[PDB]
Design an enzyme around this catalytic site. Structure first.
Site, mmCIF file in Angstrom:
data_model
loop_
_atom_site.group_PDB
_atom_site.id
_atom_site.type_symbol
_atom_site.label_atom_id
_atom_site.label_comp_id
_atom_site.label_asym_id
_atom_site.label_seq_id
_atom_site.Cartn_x
_atom_site.Cartn_y
_atom_site.Cartn_z
ATOM 1 C CD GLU A 1 -1.454 -25.094 18.520
ATOM 2 O OE1 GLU A 1 -0.862 -24.469 17.615
ATOM 3 O OE2 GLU A 1 -2.675 -24.962 18.746
ATOM 4 C CG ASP B 1 -4.492 -29.047 18.977
ATOM 5 O OD1 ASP B 1 -4.110 -27.928 18.579
ATOM 6 O OD2 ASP B 1 -5.603 -29.238 19.515
ATOM 7 C CE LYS C 1 -11.163 -26.944 19.070
ATOM 8 N NZ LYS C 1 -11.657 -25.639 19.583
HETATM 9 C C1 WTM Z 1 -8.290 -17.342 17.847
HETATM 10 O O1 WTM Z 1 -7.584 -18.231 17.123
HETATM 11 C C2 WTM Z 1 -6.229 -18.248 17.424
HETATM 12 C C3 WTM Z 1 -5.390 -19.205 16.830
HETATM 13 C C4 WTM Z 1 -4.018 -19.234 17.135
HETATM 14 C C5 WTM Z 1 -3.018 -20.281 16.507
HETATM 15 C C6 WTM Z 1 -3.562 -21.678 16.332
HETATM 16 N N1 WTM Z 1 -4.450 -22.040 17.496
HETATM 17 C C7 WTM Z 1 -5.418 -23.178 17.438
HETATM 18 O O2 WTM Z 1 -5.522 -23.839 16.493
HETATM 19 C C8 WTM Z 1 -6.289 -23.426 18.716
HETATM 20 N N2 WTM Z 1 -6.660 -22.251 19.496
HETATM 21 C C9 WTM Z 1 -7.470 -22.385 20.707
HETATM 22 C C10 WTM Z 1 -7.833 -21.084 21.495
HETATM 23 C C11 WTM Z 1 -8.034 -19.912 20.793
HETATM 24 C C12 WTM Z 1 -8.358 -18.718 21.480
HETATM 25 C C13 WTM Z 1 -8.470 -18.723 22.849
HETATM 26 C C14 WTM Z 1 -8.266 -19.899 23.555
HETATM 27 C C15 WTM Z 1 -7.939 -21.096 22.867
HETATM 28 F F1 WTM Z 1 -7.741 -22.231 23.545
HETATM 29 N N3 WTM Z 1 -7.923 -23.727 21.152
HETATM 30 C C16 WTM Z 1 -7.562 -24.900 20.389
HETATM 31 O O3 WTM Z 1 -7.916 -25.939 20.738
HETATM 32 C C17 WTM Z 1 -6.733 -24.771 19.152
HETATM 33 O O4 WTM Z 1 -6.399 -25.865 18.442
HETATM 34 C C18 WTM Z 1 -3.553 -18.260 18.032
HETATM 35 C C19 WTM Z 1 -4.453 -17.312 18.597
HETATM 36 N N4 WTM Z 1 -5.726 -17.325 18.291
HETATM 37 MN MN MN Z 2 -6.712 -27.474 20.143
HETATM 38 MN MN MN Z 3 -4.430 -25.943 17.496
#
Ligand code: WTM
Ligand code: MN
Ligand code: MN
Ligand code: QQ4
Length: 185
Positions: free
Chosen positions: A70, A98, A124
């Protein structure tokens, strides 16, 4: 400057709550997927929180234990994932995780929730399906839940993350921002 605002209470809070570089990575991660942190401010704070938890998580343990997935752009993150799989032999995960644990030889999917950690992991675990990628959920209330009850890190490192999570919750509530943040997941 029409539908895109000059500032928001949540945006100003995110900028004073999180380290500047974490804010920059969250902006890059959102814009890579067509999302603007100036309007979807609840997702802006959640991405910042998830970023910081991931960095705290990797800060726990030995120096070379974790490979941080990440925080990189999608292409570079998938490139490092390919290298890890083509080096250790671990199966290529369908979804971008991540971290990777060189000590435990498994990828880690970190989750931060505003509900009970039970529903999130259950989500998940069903999304990634592969019972090889480790899952570790943290809540803004102080709970946590990991695959096979294996919490990877020491208790002190995890307690630091739970403490920070509750501090972010308190700071939002004192600005009347928590209820909209909680109802946004
Ligand atoms: C909607 O999807 C996305 C993806 C990204 C980039 C990669 N993000 C993840 O992979 C990733 N995202 C999240 C998450 C996504 C939306 C709101 C709160 C969150 F916590 N949780 C994870 O655990 C997690 O791994 C940016 C914005 N929106
Ligand atoms: Mn995550
Ligand atoms: Mn992620
Ligand atoms: C490598 C570099 C950035 C790293 C980000 C990550 C941040 C880490 C910094 C530590 C030290 N501390 C602790 C005190 C304050 C501080 O700052 N922590 C953890 C806690 C908060 C924080 O900030 N780490 C880990 C290695 C050194 C470093 O800086 N990242 C970004 C995503 C991938 C990655 O590894 N990279 C790589 C290329 C682009 C870039 O920027």
């Amino acid at each position: 400057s029409g539908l895109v605002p000059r500032g928001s209470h949540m945006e100003d809070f995110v900028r004073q709550c999180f380290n500047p570089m974490i804010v920059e990575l969250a902006e890059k991660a959102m814009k890579e997927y067509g999302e603007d942190p100036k309007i979807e401010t609840n997702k802006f704070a959640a991405t910042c929180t998830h970023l910081e938890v991931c960095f705290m998580y990797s800060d726990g343990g030995s120096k070379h234990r974790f490979e941080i997935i990440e925080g990189r752009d999608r292409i570079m993150a998938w490139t490092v994932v390919n290298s890890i799989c083509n080096t250790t032999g671990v199966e290529k995960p369908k979804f971008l995780p991540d971290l990777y644990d060189y000590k435990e030889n498994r990828f880690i999917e970190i989750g931060v929730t505003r509900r009970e950690v039970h529903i999130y992991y259950l989500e998940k675990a069903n999304k990634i399906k592969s019972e090889k990628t480790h899952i570790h959920i943290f809540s803004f209330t102080g709970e946590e839940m990991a695959t096979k009850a294996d919490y990877t890190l020491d208790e002190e490192s995890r307690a630091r993350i739970k403490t920070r999570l509750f501090t972010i919750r308190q700071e939002m509530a004192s600005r009347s921002l928590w209820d909209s943040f909680r109802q946004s997941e």
